[PDB]
Structures are given as structure tokens and as C-alpha cells.
Design a protein around this ligand. Structure first.
Ligand SMILES: N#C/C(=C\c1ccc2c[nH]nc2c1)C(=O)NCCN1CCOCC1
Length: 462
């Protein structure tokens, strides 16, 4: 909330990963965990750990005087620029004008710099070098609102973007930061246009509205252990993993699917004795999206898919990727959904081919999945979902590139296997098709020989 307390100060200095965890556990026991303090601490520790070193053990000591001085600089900067007397607060709500003033104060403070660099996500970066990445700006606006006592201002998050909410139940929204490269500044606006256009970017309104403890979870997920393109900090990974289990135990990941996926990935990296296994945690992320977000999130199934892929469970990887396409078909592809376009592209035209290549190799060298018609049915459901996604969307999704791998992947199954799935137009396995194009090739897909140039054109059509 506002001002460092003795209950926080008595836990300094922070001389270890566990000391940091202890400070977070103390803060998470309060109604208003201090976002500024916790972000400064994480940014300080990350800044000094994210470098290659000589020396088996190392931890950069967070002395209270350094943290307290940075904290005072931020608080003075915010309190001195925002006259609360000019903004009558009627009923515990913040006015859209007040929220835009705080946002501009942050915004006008920033440095020219490469806004997609690592380790500029925390308030440490903001205070010491006036640099923030995209979502770091949104987080900084929420921290500054907490520093002013605006208890209703909170972080909102989609799977690819951040803004703020405020007013009763977070009814009000405001853009505070940029998104992508080149798009027109929407700061100050609501997000209703993006919700209304059914873009993935705004999740049809099924986006996350954080309380203060989920904002803590956000800044933990935002830790970046990357030192260079080949190296991660093991200390930062351990710190993030321990903090996520703390958040998990207190219930603050219940509505945070991406944090549960992150935690499962970290457990796959390095299992914690006595904890649920990664698969359990991936399914909890999916359960969370189904329960709180109308099953309208993509990454819960991508997380699961990646894990199955790494472990060479080809059927379950394919089934998870089909699930991602079943979710995406109900969106319209819009002018800033590119990041999810890229993910589906690499899955269709890179990962799935190589998985299938390896499974071919494996059979060419002596019960494959290419012999499982269920896997072929999953492959069809995946492509059916992407076709319907493109329907009713201006940007052309499929094209000649997608065409060659599609037919290459179909060939990876012999006719006798393929002929065992009954394909049903929407209006062995039994599979219903939802898209125009895949309804079209209904019988080509199961012929003893594959009509290449046919399938190639029916997909790239229109
Ligand atoms: N990229 C990526 C991400 C996850 C992911 C997870 C599993 C996957 C499997 N294959 N690709 C995968 C990708 C991701 O979460 N980043 C964006 C997070 N937002 C949050 C709001 O603020 C802006 C940033």
C-alpha cells in the first residue's frame, strides 16, 4: 500500500532466495501486499543475478537502504505529480480522469530504447533507468495507483496484452501501454472495441481481472531468468518456482491458468518432492480456464501440448493441439492477433511435421501412432479448427505454405489407418467437421492415394 513498515523492514537484509520468499510470504498475508516493494526487490535480485559469473554460489544482497531509497524515489515521484484534491473520489471509485493522469505520469517518465529487451519489466528498471517493457508499464501504473490509495485500480491481462481496470467490480477499463509494433496508440481508451471484435487479443472479454494477490502472481511470472541466448539463471528459476508454490498454496493461482502452466514447466525442469506432477498442474490450468474463463484461452492447451511433444506422447500432443484449434475457431482473426497466428503456424508447418517424421523414422526402423486412427482424427480436428477460424476473418490465414505440410502429414498415415475414421459434416473414431473447406475434402482425406494438387487448392481457396 503506502510506505515501508517495520514488519517488512525487519526481514532485511535479503541474503538468499529463501529470504526473498519469506518477504513475499509476509506480504501475501496482508490485505494490500506492497507491489512497489516486491517489484523493486525482484528487479534488484534479477538485475544482479542475470549475468554470467565465476563462483559456484552467489546472491546479491538486497540491503534495506538501497530498496528503501528506490522506494522513496518512486513514491515521491508519484505523490508530487498527482494532486488527489483535484480528483474527487465518489464512492471508493477512481475517475477515468484520475486513472489517465497516473498513466501519463508513468508514460511521460520513460526514456528512446529497444522496448523488447530483457530485464526491463520491474519497477527497479523504471526507477534506475526509466525503461519498461510493454506490460511493465501497465504494472507500473497499477503500482502507482496503489501508492496513491486507489484500491479499485487493478491489472487486467489477456494472453498477449495488459491494461487496467477500475470502478465497481472493475467495470471500467483503460489502455495504459502499447501493443505490438506500429499499431496506433489506444492509451486512454476502453478495451470494449477489442472485446466487441471477437479478437483473440481481448479473449472475447474472458480476460483476467487481478486482485492485489494476483498482481503479485503476475510479477512472479514476469521474472526473466534468461542471461543470454544459451543460458538461464538457476537461482532465478528456483526463486520463481518457490514463489509460484507459495502463491499456489494460498490459492492465488486458482484463476491464473498461465501461472499454473509456468509452474508445471518449472516442475518438469526440476520436480519438487511431494508436489503434484506437471501433468496434474497442466490439467489444473485447463480446469481453471474452463471454470473462470469460459474455456476461451489458448495457452492452457498449448502448455499441455508442448509437454506431450517433449515427452514424445504423439497422440496426446496431437489431441491437445486439436483442442487449441477447437478454441480458436470461435474467434475472428484480427489486426493484432499475430502472436497466436505465429504459434499455430509453427505447430502446423514445423512441430507436427517433425513429430511425424520422427515417428516415420521410428517405424522404418521396426505399435506406432501413425497406425492409430485416433491420431489421424486429432490431426483432422486441428486443421478443421483453423479453417473455421479463418472463416469470417479478413486476413488470409491459410496459404500455399500451409498447403504442403498438410498433405505431407496426411501421407504419414496409410489408407487402411485413415479409412477407419468416419467423417461427418457438421450441419473406429467418429469426427464431425465444422468448416467449409474441410467439409469439402471429406472423402479426399481417406482415399488409398492422396489427391495432392486437389487438397492443395481446396485449402488455399478464397
Ligand atoms: N508466447 C508465449 C506465452 C506462453 C506460451 C505458453 C505455452 C506455449 C506452448 N507453445 N507456445 C507457448 C507459449 C505467454 O504466456 N506470453 C504472453 C503473456 N502475456 C501476458 C499478458 O501480458 C503480456 C504477456
Amino acid at each position: 500500500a503506502m510506505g515501508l513498515k517495520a514488519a517488512q523492514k525487519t526481514l532485511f537484509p535479503l541474503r538468499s532466495i529463501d529470504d526473498v520468499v519469506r518477504l513475499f510470504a509476509a506480504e501475501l498475508g496482508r490485505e494490500e501486499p506492497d507491489l512497489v516493494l516486491l517489484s523493486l526487490v525482484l528487479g534488484f535480485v534479477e538485475h544482479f543475478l542475470a549475468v554470467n559469473r565465476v563462483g559456484l554460489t552467489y546472491f546479491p544482497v538486497a540491503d534495506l537502504s538501497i530498496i528503501a531509497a528506490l522506494y522513496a524515489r518512486f513514491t515521491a515521484q508519484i505523490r508530487g505529480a498527482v494532486d488527489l484534491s483535484l480528483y474527487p473520489r465518489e464512492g471508493g471509485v477512481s475517475s477515468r480522469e484520475l486513472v489517465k493522469k497516473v498513466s501519463d505520469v508513468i508514460w511521460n517518465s520513460l526514456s528512446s530504447y529497444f522496448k523488447d529487451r530483457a530485464h526491463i519489466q520491474s519497477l527497479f528498471s523504471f526507477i534506475t533507468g526509466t525503461k519498461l517493457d510493454s506490460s511493465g508499464v501497465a504494472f507500473a501504473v497499477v503500482g502507482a495507483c496503489q501508492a496513491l490509495g486507489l484500491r479499485d485500480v487493478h491489472l487486467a491481462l489477456s494472453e498477449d496484452h495488459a491494461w487496467v481496470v477500475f470502478g465497481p467490480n472493475g467495470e471500467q477499463t483503460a489502455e495504459v501501454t502499447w501493443h505490438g509494433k506500429g499499431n496506433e496508440d489506444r492509451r486512454g481508451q476502453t478495451v470494449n472495441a477489442g472485446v466487441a471484435e471477437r479478437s483473440w487479443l481481448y479473449l472475447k472479454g474472458s480476460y483476467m481481472r487481478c486482485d492485489r494477490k494476483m498482481e503479485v502472481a503476475f510479477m512472479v511470472c514476469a521474472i526473466n531468468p534468461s542471461i543470454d541466448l544459451h543460458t538461464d539463471s538457476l537461482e532465478l528459476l528456483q526463486l520463481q518456482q518457490k514463489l509460484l508454490w507459495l502463491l499456489y498454496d494460498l490459492g492465488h493461482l486458482e484463476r491464473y491458468p498461465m501461472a499454473l502452466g509456468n509452474l508445471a514447466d518449472l516442475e518438469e525442469l526440476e520436480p519438487t518432492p511431494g508436489r503434484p506432477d506437471p501433468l496434474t498442474l497442466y490439467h489444473k490450468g485447463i480446469a481453471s480456464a474452463k471454470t473462470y474463463y469460459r474455456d476461451e484461452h489458448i495457452y492452457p492447451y498449448m502448455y499441455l501440448a508442448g509437454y506431450h511433444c517433449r515427452n514424445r506422447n504423439v497422440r496426446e500432443a496431437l489431441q491437445a493441439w486439436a483442442d487449441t484449434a477447437t478454441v480458436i475457431q470461435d474467434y475472428n482473426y484480427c489486426r493484432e492477433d499475430e502472436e497466436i497466428y505465429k504459434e499455430f503456424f509453427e505447430v502446423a508447418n514445423d512441430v507436427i511435421p517433425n513429430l511425424l517424421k520422427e515417428a516415420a523414422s521410428l517405424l522404418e526402423a521396426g505399435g506406432s501412432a501413425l497406425q492409430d486412427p485416433e491420431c489421424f482424427a486429432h490431426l483432422l480436428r486441428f486443421y478443421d479448427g483453423i479453417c473455421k477460424w479463418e472463416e469470417g476473418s479478413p486476413t488470409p490465414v491459410l496459404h500455399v505454405g500451409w498447403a504442403t505440410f498438410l498433405v505431407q502429414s496426411l501421407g504419414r498415415f496409410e489408407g487402411q489407418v485413415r479409412q477407419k475414421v468416419r467423417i461427418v459434416s457438421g450441419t473406429g473414431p467418429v469426427l464431425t467437421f465444422q468448416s467449409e473447406k474441410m467439409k469439402g475434402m471429406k472423402e479426399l482425406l481417406v482415399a488409398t492415394k492422396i489427391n495432392s494438387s486437389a487438397i492443395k487448392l481446396q485449402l488455399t481457396a478464397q
